[PDB]
């Protein structure tokens, strides 16, 4: 059911939606 | 890696979760 591709922006955001890891963890840029 | 997987391939609810902790 939740088997799609999340590239570009989708992941950086997904984190916020589930467990925000964009602090001093995995807060990368492209 | 953290994103690569859910980008080049597809991932699941848990594959995502890992980030969490």
From Swiss-Prot, chain B:
Cystines in this chain: 6-11
Protein name listed in UniProt: Insulin A chain
Provenance organism: Homo sapiens
Lineage: Eukaryota, Metazoa, Chordata, Craniata, Vertebrata
Residue numbers of the full-length protein present here: 90 to 110 of 110
């Amino acid at each position: 059911f939740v088997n799609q591709h999340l590239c570009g922006s989708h992941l950086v955001e997904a984190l916020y939606l589930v467990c925000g890891e964009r602090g001093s963890f995995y807060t990368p840029k492209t | 890696g953290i994103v690569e997987q859910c980008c080049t391939s597809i991932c699941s609810l848990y594959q995502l979760e890992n980030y969490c902790n």
